[PDB]
């Protein structure tokens with residue numbers, strides 16, 4: 311069903327839904343690995359379904375519809391702890407490339423596309439441990455898609471070759487993000 315921001319497990323899938331307190335977003339958990347997001351003149355939000363804890367070698371499958379009108383992205387999204395790391399494997403995005411401002415670290419080929427990899431430091435920003443400072447890693451698919459399989463190990467290994475030390479895995483989801491935009495998405499994870 312439709313829920314306010316929070317975390318939990320639904321039909322065997324972890325979910326996380328976060329927003330900045332601005333209105334305009336409706337997040338709904340559905341059967342199995344399915345979730346939907348519908349948004350209209352939102353603020354900043356990110357939510358979806360997957361695993362808690364994730365793993366460093368998961369092959370993540372997703373399918374469904376992704377129709378943003380503005381700034382948004384569809385990604386494999388997760389965290390590690392000790393050290394604290396936020397990471398995104400971006401499969402599709404809307405009007406803004408979310409790696410803008412991050413430092414390019416190279417390229418990796420995975421699951422049918424080249425990806426550009428990046429990192430940036432986030433300073434005194436929201437996180438799974440509260441306000442914190444942490445590196446944020448990106449891997450941005452060149453050939454955008456809304457269904458596919460992601461071999462996370464290829465991305466983790468590419469980042470590691472440029473200095474990522476992944477700590478203890480925390481959640482790991484397929485997420486829809488929006489940033490002052492509108493859209494809809496209906497995604498099934500497995």
Ligand SMILES: O[C@@H]1[C@@H](O)[C@H](O[C@@H]2CO[C@@H](O[C@@H]3CO[C@@H](O)[C@H](O)[C@H]3O)[C@H](O)[C@H]2O)OC[C@H]1O
Pocket residue numbers: 326328354355356396436437438439440
């Ligand atoms: O109540 C606390 C939650 O609000 C907190 O949630 C996390 C806060 O950070 C969220 O981060 C996304 C960090 O980066 C941008 O990439 C996202 O836009 C931030 O908002 C994250 O998605 C939430 O899980 O967890 C700790 C709780 O105590």
